[PDB]
Every structure is written in structure tokens, then in C-alpha cells.
Amino acid sequence: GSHSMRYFSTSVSRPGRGEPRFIAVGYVDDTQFVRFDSDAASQRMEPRAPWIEQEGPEYWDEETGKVKAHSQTDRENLRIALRYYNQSEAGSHTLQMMFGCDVGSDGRFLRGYHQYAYDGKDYIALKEDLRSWTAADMAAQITKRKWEAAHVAEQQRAYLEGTCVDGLRRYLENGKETLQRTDPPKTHMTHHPISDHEATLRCWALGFYPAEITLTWQRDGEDQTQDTELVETRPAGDGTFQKWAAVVVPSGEEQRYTCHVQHEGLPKPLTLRW
Amino acid sequence: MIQRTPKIQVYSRHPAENGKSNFLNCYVSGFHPSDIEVDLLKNGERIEKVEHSDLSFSKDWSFYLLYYTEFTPTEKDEYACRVNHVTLSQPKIVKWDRDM
Amino acid sequence: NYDYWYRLF
User: Fold this and answer.
1) Would the CB atoms of C6 and A76 count as touching at under 8 Å?
2) Which of A17, A67, A134, A206 could bond to A36 as cystine, CB 3.0-4.6 Å?
3) Are residues A171 and A191 in the same domain?
4) Do A77 and C5 make contact, defined as CB atoms within 8 angstroms?
């Protein structure tokens, strides 16, 4: 199928507590592979997956160089943002950036991303045509204006549709054994009496990769949608993911319910019944 | 700016069976700002040498971290995760329910 | 591969 590469950054100003902390991370699909931490001692982009550990010293030099430049850039954008919002130079703020690309199952560009959030809400983002910007507010309109006069977007297009896809393609090869795997969910059901007349059925999905999954409960074939408790898909810590879905059921009606598991590692969706 | 409260999940990497080594996981997600303290407790005492993931964030820019430690479930020991975020007027403690 | 990002708000 398709694949993605994502870089995520966070810069957190620390007034009355230091100088702005910058953390960047790289993902391919749902597998992290580099980090950078401005407070860590190394001051180096480091490997986080086994399959990236096979790049030359000059990859690491170069990737360290770029991330460090980004950290100085968002350091200064933090200052500019304080201005644009007329905010005190004494409070802590958050500049978050994401960028990267998707590719289709043959390797071709699908989509490029470049976007910014300030204090957790949208700031400015590159629209899909890689040609225009979507600004969240008046403050981000100053930026949109600056960046259109300057043709910032056209100049990102070399990276988005070239470097980004090419690196993604090179990662999917050197990481084939781990990044083109599809690990289907190990499923089971639990069942706990809650009262004289009520029971919890919980549908478990374990050990799957990639993270995307869907679990829905039916009652006699009808989607049960509000009696259902659903957890955020979580990481096991070994590179796979977990999730569960639970319904509270009247005692003795357990057979009436079924749980349905769709994951791209499953030929046919699984239906589970206590 | 709006802050968001963390969603806290505590769990083992594999189904618990007393005796065999495992990992204890505390997953905080969907929170903002990123400043957060997260601690794992064995019988109310803070486990030293806990590892955590590199700070990342979701589509909606909310943050998530995984905190974890090697451990071995025993029939008498209790486990919890203690999350300390600006949006919690007191630290939240979620006990380890071997089935969530 | 990271980007070379220098554009200011």
C-alpha cells in the first residue's frame, strides 16, 4: 500500500527557566527512526530504529546539521510569535512543526505537508497544491503575506516531491523486513460480571502493526455505538500496538453481541462472539 | 490557549502471568502543553529507572509519551502510574488493572 | 532526510 514520512518538532520557550528546548523526531509510517533533543549532551541526530543505523557518517553529520538549523529557526519564530500576539516575554509557549510526504504503492508522490501550530492551535499550513498557505488567524496572515511575496511554497517543492519521497523510498528498502511487514492482531475476549444482571465484554486486539485498526461492537447485527467504551490505540513498546473495545451487556445476553476487527493484516475481518 | 488533559493508560506489554518478566506501560496521550511528570509506583513507591519515549504529537498537535519499565508481576504487588500535569488540580493515579 | 528550513514568521 501507501507510506508516509513525518518529521515532528516541538520548541518550548522557558523564560525564567533557561533557553528554548527543541525536540524533533522522525517516523516512517508508525515506526520512529531518529530523534534530536536540544538539551541532550550529544547534540546529534540519533538513530531510533535498527535499519537506519546503516547510514554513513556523512548522513548523520548532514542530518544533524539540518535539524540544528531548524531549532535556531523555530527559536526565532518563537520570538516573532510573541510579538505578533503581543504576549509577555515571561510565559512559556510551544511552537510545533510537522512536515513530510506520502507515497503510493509504486513510490510516487501523493501529498506533501508543512504546517505549524502555536500553543496547540493551527498557525500556518501548506495547502495540498504545494502552492498556497492556510493561515489560522490575523497573526498567521502576516506570515502568509510574507511567505507569498517570497515564494516560500514553490521553494519547498523540491524537498517535498523529491528529497522526501527519495528518502522515504530508500527507507522502505533498507527497512523492508520491518517496515513492509504487516502483523495481524492477536484477538481475544474477556468477560467480567458487574452486577447481578450486567456484564462487561471487552474485545482485545494485540500485537498488530501498523497502528490503524477498527473495532466495532454489534448487537444482533446493528452497530452499537454509544454503549461502547473505546481506548486510544496504544503502543506495546516493542513496535506493535494494542487496543480494546468494551460493551456493558445484560447478563445472559452475551451471545447477542459480536465484535468486528478490521486490520490490513487480516485477509477477512474477524468476528468474535463470547 | 486551550490546554488538554492527558488520557492515561497503564497496562502490560503482554497479558500478566505472575512469575514471567514483562513490561509495565503508562501511555499518556492527547495533552497540552507538553510539560508533564509521569511516574510508575510499586506499592505506592516511585520506581526508579523508568524509561520514556521521545516527545511526539498527533494530527491534532496533542502530545503523547510512553513510559515503561521492565518488571515481573507478582500476586501481591500493586502497580500504578502517577501523572502530574498543569490541568490536574492534583496528580492523577491510575491503578494497574491487569485487564484495563 | 530532514529539510533545510530557515523561513521566519
Assistant:
1) no
2) A67
3) no
4) no
Q: Nearest Cβ partner of C7 from A24, A147, A163?
A: A147
Search chain A and give the residue with CA nearest B30.
A232
Complete edge-to-edge strand list for the sheet that includes strand A31-37: A46-47, A31-37, A21-28, A3-12, A94-103, A109-118, A121-126, A133-135
The domain in which residue A228 lies consists of 182-274
B27:A235 CB<8 A: yes
Domain boundary among A160, A181, A202: A181
DSSP conformational letter for A209: B
Q: Are A8 and A25 in contact (CB under 8 A)?
A: yes
Tell if the CB–CB gap between A120 and B30 is shorter than 8 Å: no
- The total number of structural domains in chain B stands at 1
Question: A132 is written with which cell numbers?
Answer: 498556497
The C-alpha atoms of residue A179 and residue A196 are separated, in whole angstroms, by 48
Method underlying the structure: X-ray
d(CA A17, CA A14): 5
Q: What is the resolution of this structure in A?
A: 2.4
For A24, counting Cβ atoms within 10 Å of its Cβ (0-12 exposed, 13-18 middle, 19+ buried), the class is buried
Q: How many domains does chain A have?
A: 2
Same-domain pairing of A159 and A201: no
Instruction: Describe the crossing of helices A138-149 and A57-84 by its angle, rounded to 10 degrees.
Output: 130
- Asked if omega into B15 is within 30° of 0 (cis), the reply is no
Residues of A with Cβ-Cβ distance to C1 under 8 angstroms = 63, 66, 163-164, 166-167
